[model samples]
Target: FRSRLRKLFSHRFQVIIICLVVLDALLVLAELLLDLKVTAFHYMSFAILVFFMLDLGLRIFAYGFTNPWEVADGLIVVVSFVLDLVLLFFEALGLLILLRLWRVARIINGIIISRMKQLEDKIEELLSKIYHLENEIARL
Candidate 1:
C-alpha cells in the first residue's frame, strides 16, 4: 500500500498540481481585477473535488481507516456537486474563495517539505566541510 501510493503521488503529479494552482491563481486574479463573472471557475471546482477525492482515496488505501483526520477531510468533498449554484451562480462574496482551503493546506505542506529538505541538505554540506576543516587543523 505504501509503495503503491508513494508511486501514485510521486513527483510529477505535484508539478501538475503546481501548474494547476498557478492557473487558478491567475483566474482568481482576473476575477478580482476585472470584476468579471467567471462561470468557468465555478464549474471547475469539480476538478478540485476530483483531485482531492483521488488524493484522499490513495491515502485511505495506503493508511487504512486509522486516521481520524482523513474522515474529516472526506466530509468536505461532496461528490454530487453543483458548481453553478455552489460557486458560479452565487454572487462573489467571502464565500467564493472558501473552496480552496484544501488547496492551501496542501501547498503549505509541500512548501514545508521543500524548505525542510533544503535546510537538511545545507546542514549536511556544512557538517562535511567542518569535518574536513577539523582534520586539516589536526594535521594527524
Candidate 2:
C-alpha cells in the first residue's frame, strides 16, 4: 500500500495537484483584487486548506521530501492551518493578512520546488553521461 501510494502520487495525482494549485493562485488574486468575501470564496479556501493538509501528510508518508524548500512548503501549510482555525474562532485583519502572506510563500516555494526538480533531472542526465564516458575511457 505504501509503494502504491508513492507511485500513484508521484505520477497521476500530480495533475490534480497542479490544477488545484493554479486555482488557488487565482482565488488569491480574486480575494486581493476584488475583495471577495462571499461564502463560496471562504468555502473554497477551507476546502483547499484541508486538501493541502492532507497533501502534506500524504507527501510526507509517501514521496517524502528532504529539501528545505519542500520542508518550508509543509511548514507553510501547518502555519496556515493553525491560523485558519484561529481565525474561525476569533477573526482578525492581521491574521488574515498573515494567512495571505503564507499563501504567497507557498506559491513561491512551489515554483522553487519545480525548478529544483528540473535541476535534479539535468544533473541526473549529466551524471549518466559522465558515467558512460568513464566506462568508455576505462575500456580504451
Per-model TM-score, in order, reads 0.46, 0.48
Instruction: State the lDDT of candidate 1 residue by residue for 1-140, as single tens digits.
Output: 24655555545665765676566555445555455445656445446545544554454335326558646544444331223125644245335454444556655674787789889999999999999899999886
Query: Per-residue lDDT for 11-83 in model 2, tens only?
Result: 3455666666566555545544444335567567556755654664565446435779657766767667566
For each of the candidates, the C-alpha root-mean-square deviation to the true structure, in angstroms, is: 6.9, 5.4
Q: What C-alpha lDDT do the candidate models reach, one value each?
A: 0.54, 0.62
Best candidate, lDDT-wise?
2
Location of the lowest summed lDDT over 10 successive residues in candidate 2: 28-37
Point to the candidate with the largest TM-score.
2
